[PDB]
Structure 1
Amino acid sequence: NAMYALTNCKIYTGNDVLVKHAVIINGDKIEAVCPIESLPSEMNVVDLNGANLSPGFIDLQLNGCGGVMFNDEITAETIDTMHKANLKSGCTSFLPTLITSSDENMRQAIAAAREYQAKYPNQSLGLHLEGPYLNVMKKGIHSVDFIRPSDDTMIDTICANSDVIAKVTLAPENNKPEHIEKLVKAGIVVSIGHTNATYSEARKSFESGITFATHLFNAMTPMVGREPGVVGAIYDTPEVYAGIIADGFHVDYANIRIAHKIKGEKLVLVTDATAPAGAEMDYFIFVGKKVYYRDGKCVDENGTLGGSALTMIEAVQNTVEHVGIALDEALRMATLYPAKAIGVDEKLGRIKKGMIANLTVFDRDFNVKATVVNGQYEQ
C-alpha cells in the first residue's frame, strides 16, 4: 500500500551500476532510482546489506524445474510451481516451454498458459512452443513419432492464440514460408532451431520473419568451410537473437565468448532447464527416457548429457566467471536482452521509473538472497 525503498546495494539498472543509491518501489512499479540520501524522512526501507540488485532474470527457454516437467503435467498449476522454483534462483519471468507432442497436448498448454496469466501478470509471458515441426536429423531427444511438418491447421491455431503464445521454435528448411510470416504477423516470435538448414536456408527463414535462434550450437548446422550453416547464418545476421545454455556442458565456454563478441546484445542466456533445476532429485522422465541427475549434469545412464539443470543465476555467474564477460553485461544477457527479444522491454528488463518492479537480489558469491515480483518482496 505505502511505498518501500530498497537500500544499501550495488544497483545494476541495466544502463548503470550505482552505489549509495536506492530504489523506491510503489505497488508494482518502480518510482525512482536516486541517491540514498534523498529518500523521504519516514519512507519505509529495506537494507540489502550491500548485496547486488538487478532486474529479475528472464528465462526464454524452460521446460520445467522445481521437480516438475510442463510436458507431463501440462497444467496451469505446473506453471505456478515452476514460477516459485525460478524465484529461488532469481528468475522472475519465463516461457513455459512445451516440447514436440500431440496436437492435443498443444491445445491444453494454450489453455494452461491462458488460465495462469489471467490470474498473474509478468510471470509466464507466453508459451514457447518448441516443435513439433522440426527436422529428424537434428531431433535431439524429441520423439521420432511426434515430429512432423507444419500443417495449415495447427499454425492457424497457434496464431488464433497469439495472445498467450510468445515464441515458436521451428526448422524452416522444409516448412512453408507462409507459416513463418503468418506467425510473425500474429505478433509471435519465430525461432530457428532443431534444424538441418543451410546457411542460405536460414537466411531465407530470417527474411520471412525469424528473429531468434534457440540454443545456439545445439541441434543446428554447424559452420563449416564451404557451408556457414545455421551458426554461420546467425553470426552473419545482425537482427537475430541467439539463446545460449551456459552450463559448461551444452556448449564450450570459449564458444560462448566468441559468440558474444560476434553477437553482442543479441546473445541471450537461457536455461532450457529441466525438473532437477531448483530441486533435489535422483532422476526423471524426458518424454520417455530416464535422465539421472549426477552432481550437476543431466545424463542418460551411459553418462551422455540428457538435458539441462541450469539455473538463471548460475548462468550469469558462469558467464562472468568462465566466459570472461563483465558482470554488468552478463546481467543484461539475463534480463534486457531477452526482454527486448520478446518485446516486453518497455516494462521489464531495466531498473527505471515507470517499469514493473521485478527485481532480484544476490550476493558477491552469486547467492540469490531475495526477489521482488510486481512489488512483492520475498526471500
Structure 2
Amino acid sequence: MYALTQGRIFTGHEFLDDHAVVIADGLIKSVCPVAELPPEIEQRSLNGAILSPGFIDVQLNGCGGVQFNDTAEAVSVETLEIMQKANEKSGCTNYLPTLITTSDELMKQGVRVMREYLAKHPNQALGLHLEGPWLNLVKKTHNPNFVRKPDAALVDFLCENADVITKVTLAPEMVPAEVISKLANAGIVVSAGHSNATLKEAKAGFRAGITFATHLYNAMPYITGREPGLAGAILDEADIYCGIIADGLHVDYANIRNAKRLKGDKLCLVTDATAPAGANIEQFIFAGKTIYYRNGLCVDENGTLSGSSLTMIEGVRNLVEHCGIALDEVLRMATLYPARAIGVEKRLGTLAAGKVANLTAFTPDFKITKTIVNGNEVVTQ
C-alpha cells in the first residue's frame, strides 16, 4: 500500500487540504488527514496538484488515432486498448466505447469484442454504448408503438447481452414503448438521441424507461416557444441525466450555462470525441464520411462541423473558464454524475474507502500530472 499526499484532494463531495488517499490492492483504502496515516507508509507527493476521481466519458467514438466504428478490423479489442491509453493521458480512466451503426454483424462483433475485452481489463472501458439502429437520421408506418418483427429480434439480442451493453441511444418517436421498457428492465441505460421528438413524444419515452439523453441540443430539434422538443423536455424533466459536449463548438457556452442551472446534478461532461483527440490526425472516416481535422475543428468536405476532438481535461477546463461553473462542480460533472447515470457509483466516481483506485491529478492550469488505474500509475508528467 501507498499514500498520495501534499496536494488538494477532491473526494467528489469536498476539497481537502493536508489529507491523504491510501491505496492498496487496487482500491482506495482510506481518505484521512496526513497525521492519521500509518507510521512509515510510503508517501508519494502530489506536488501541489489537484487529485480527482478519474474522469468517466460516457460517449466516445474514437481517440488516439483510432475509432471503434465503421470496419470489422477497427471494432476490436486492440482499438479499445488504444483508446484507454490515450484517454489516460487526458485524465480519463473510464469510458463507454460508442459504436454508431445499423449493421447487425458489426453490432454482434462489437458485443463479442466488448466481452473479450472486459475479461482481460477490469475498471477501464466499462461497456458498450450502442447508438443504433433506431435513429431518426438527420431527417424525420406504425403508430410507432407497434413492435415490428426485426425490431423484436434485435431487442431480444440486446437484452441477452445486457451484461456488456451499458447504454443504447435511440430516438423515442421511432420505437415502441415496449422496447424501451424491455431494455431498461434488462439493466441497459436507454438514452434519447438523434431524434426529432416533440416534447410529448419525449415524455412518453421517459415514462417507458429512458433515463438519459445523448449530447443535449445536438441532433435534437431546436427549441421554439410553442414546441420545446426533446431538448426542452430534457431540461424540464428533473430525473433525466444528460451528456453535453463542452468544446465551445457544438454548444454555445450560454446554452451550457442554462442547461447546468436547469439540470443541476444531472448534467454530465462528455467528449463525443473521434480519432483526432489525443493524436495528430489530419483526416479520417466516420459513419461513412470523410472528416478533416483543421484545427480546433472536425469538418466535412462542405466545412460543416462533423465531429469532436475534445478530451475530458479540456472539457473540465472549458466548463470552469467559460461557463462560470465552480471547479468542484465541474469535477462532479466528469466523475460522480456520469457514474451515477450509468449505475457504477458503488465502485467509481468518488474518492472514498472501498472504491476502485482510478484517479487523476492535474495542475491549476489543467495539465495532467498523474493518472492511476486500478492503483497503478500509468501516466506520470
Question: Into which bin does the TM-score normalised by the smaller protein fall?
Answer: over 0.9
Deviations along 1:91-146, one digit per CA (max 9) or x if unpaired, are: 0000011002311100000011000011111111110001111113458xxxxxxx
Deviations along 1:275-294, one digit per CA (max 9) or x if unpaired, are: 00011111111122221111
Q: Distance in 2 between matches of 1:180 and 1:66?
A: 33
Q: Distance in 2 between matches of 1:149 and 1:215?
A: 30
Deviation at 1:38, TM superposition (A): 2.4
2:155 corresponds to which letter in structure 1? Answer: I
Alpha carbons 1:133, 1:149 under 8 Å: kept:
no
1:232-247 alignment, distance < 5 Å: 232-247=232-247
Q: Which residue of 1 aligns with 2:283?
A: 283
Matched, 1:220 2:201: no
Name the TM-score, length of structure 1 as normaliser. 0.95
Deviations along 1:41-87, one digit per CA (max 9) or x if unpaired, are: 21012101010100000000000101001013001111011000100
Q: Distance in 2 between matches of 1:329 and 1:149?
A: 45
Deviations along 1:201-256, one digit per CA (max 9) or x if unpaired, are: 00000000000000000011222111111111111111100100000000000000
Q: Secondary structure at the match of 2:323?
A: coil
Q: Secondary structure at the match of 2:62?
A: coil
Matched, 1:101 2:102: yes
Q: Which residue of 2 aligns with 1:74?
A: 75
Q: Distance in 2 between matches of 1:212 and 1:158?
A: 17
Q: Distance in 1 between matches of 2:98 and 2:109?
A: 13
1:115-126 alignment, distance < 5 Å: 115-126=116-127
Q: Which residue of 1 aligns with 2:328?
A: 328
1:118-157 alignment, distance < 5 Å: 118-138=119-139, 151-157=151-157
Q: Distance in 2 between matches of 1:367 and 1:131?
A: 35
Name the TM-score, length of structure 2 as normaliser. 0.95
Alpha carbons 1:211, 1:239 under 8 Å: kept:
yes
Deviation at 1:150, TM superposition (A): 6.8
2:14 corresponds to which letter in structure 1? Answer: D
Q: Which residue of 2 aligns with 1:30?
A: 28
Deviation at 1:37, TM superposition (A): 2.3
Q: Which residue of 1 aligns with 2:253?
A: 253
Q: Which residue of 2 aligns with 1:50?
A: 48
Alpha carbons 1:95, 1:126 under 8 Å: kept:
yes
Deviations along 1:176-221, one digit per CA (max 9) or x if unpaired, are: 1111000001000000000011101000000000000000000112
1:172-321 alignment, distance < 5 Å: 172-321=172-321
1:107 corresponds to which letter in structure 2? Answer: K
The percentage of aligned residue pairs carrying the same residue is: 62
Alpha carbons 1:150, 1:175 under 8 Å: kept:
no
Q: Distance in 1 between matches of 2:91 and 2:308?
A: 17
Q: Which residue of 2 aligns with 1:337?
A: 337
Q: Distance in 2 between matches of 1:198 and 1:301?
A: 31
Unpaired runs of at least 5, structure 2 = 141-147
Q: Tell me whether 349-358 or 219-228 shows the greater mean CA deviation.
A: 219-228
Q: Secondary structure at the match of 2:66?
A: coil
Q: Distance in 2 between matches of 1:235 and 1:305?
A: 24
Q: Secondary structure at the match of 2:57?
A: strand
CA-atom RMSD in angstroms: 1.3
How many residues are matched? 369
Q: Distance in 2 between matches of 1:138 and 1:327?
A: 38
Q: Distance in 2 between matches of 1:89 and 1:195?
A: 31
Q: Distance in 1 between matches of 2:333 and 2:202?
A: 23
